[PDB]
C-alpha cells in the first residue's frame, strides 16, 4: 500500500587527510537502487537495482553530475558548520541528510522529509507541513535564515510533490515484480536446553520483504514479554530480511508457548508452536 523513496547523504570531514568524503545512497522502500561515493576509484552514480538499469546513459550522467555538485556543496556546508560552532580546524565532523517522499495508503503524497544531522544530532528539519522548519540550536537558526531567504521549503515542496513522487511511481512500476509483491516470512521454531529444568524457544522469520515485521511470544494465549529477547531485523543480502525472538521457558511447558508473526506478505497473522 504505502511506499517511499528515500535518499541518505553522508559527508565526513577528515582535516589533513584530504577533502571530505561524500556518500549518497537511494532507496525505494527497503530496496537500494543507487549509490555514489566520492572516494570510489571512479566516482559515478551507480545502479544497484535492476529496475533502474534501463534508464539510459543520459539519466545516469545527470545523476552523476548532481552528486559531484552535491559533494562540493556538502563540503561548503561542513566549513560553514565548523564556523557556526567555533570548532577547530583539525577535528573531523559528520553531516547527514535524509530526504524523500512517502506515498500514503492511497498512493498519493502523504509525507515529505528533508532533515539533517550534524555529528549525529538533529540539526534542522523540514516540518510535515513542508512550510516550516525545526532548528535545533542557534547555529541551525543561521542555516534556517539562509534557507528562508532562498524559499527553501517552497523548492523542497516542489520536488517532494512533483519530481519525487513522479519518479517514485516510475520506479515502482518498472520494478513492481519485486517492489509491490510482499514476500511472506518463512518461519520455524528451534529449541535449546539451557539447564536441567529450562529451555530456550527461538521463533524465526526468514526471507521476508519488506523489512517491517513483528514477532511475539505467548503462553496459554497470554503475552510473554519479561524474558523474551528480540534481535534487530537484519538484511540477508539477497534483498530479504531476517529476525528472531527467543523466550526462556520451564522445561515441559514448551507446547504451551505460541509465536505470533505479523507481516504485510501474510494474509492474516501467523501462530506458531514448537514441533518436537
Amino acid at each position: 500500500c504505502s511506499h517511499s523513496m528515500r535518499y541518505f547523504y553522508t559527508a565526513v570531514s577528515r582535516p589533513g587527510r584530504g577533502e571530505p568524503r561524500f556518500i549518497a545512497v537511494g532507496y525505494v522502500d527497503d530496496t537500494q537502487f543507487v549509490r555514489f561515493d566520492s572516494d570510489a576509484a571512479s566516482p559515478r552514480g551507480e545502479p544497484r537495482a535492476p529496475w533502474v538499469e534501463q534508464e539510459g546513459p543520459e539519466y545516469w550522467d545527470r545523476e552523476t553530475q548532481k552528486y559531484k555538485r552535491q559533494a562540493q556543496a556538502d563540503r561548503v556546508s561542513l566549513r560553514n558548520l565548523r564556523g557556526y560552532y567555533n570548532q577547530s580546524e583539525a577535528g573531523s565532523h559528520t553531516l547527514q541528510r535524509m530526504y524523500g517522499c512517502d506515498l500514503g495508503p492511497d498512493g498519493r503524497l502523504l509525507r515529505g522529509y528533508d532533515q539533517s544531522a550534524y555529528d549525529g544530532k538533529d540539526y534542522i528539519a523540514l516540518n510535515e507541513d513542508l512550510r516550516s522548519w525545526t532548528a535545533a540550536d542557534t547555529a541551525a537558526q543561521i542555516t534556517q535564515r539562509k534557507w528562508e531567504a532562498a524559499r527553501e521549503a517552497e523548492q523542497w515542496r516542489a520536488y517532494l510533490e512533483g519530481t519525487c513522487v513522479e519518479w517514485l511511481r516510475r520506479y515502482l512500476e518498472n520494478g513492481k515484480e519485486t517492489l509491490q509483491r510482499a514476500e511472506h516470512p518463512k518461519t520455524h521454531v528451534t529449541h535449546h536446553p539451557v539447564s536441567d529444568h529450562e529451555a530456550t524457544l527461538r521463533c524465526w522469520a526468514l526471507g521476508f520483504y519488506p523489512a517491517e515485521i513483528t514477532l511475539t511470544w505467548q503462553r496459554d494465549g497470554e503475552d510473554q514479554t519479561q524474558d523474551t529477547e528480540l534481535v534487530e531485523t537484519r538484511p540477508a543480502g539477497d534483498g530479504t530480511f531476517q529476525k528472531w525472538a527467543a523466550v526462556v521457558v520451564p522445561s515441559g511447558e514448551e507446547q504451551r508457548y505460541t509465536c505470533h508473526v505479523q507481516h504485510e506478505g501474510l494474509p492474516e497473522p501467523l501462530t506458531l508452536r514448537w514441533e518436537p
Binding site: 552535491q70 539562509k146 519518479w167
Partner: peptide, 9 residues
Amino acid sequence: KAYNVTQAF
C-alpha cells in the same frame, strides 16, 4: 531521482 543540488548550510 535525486534533488537537484541543495543549498549549503
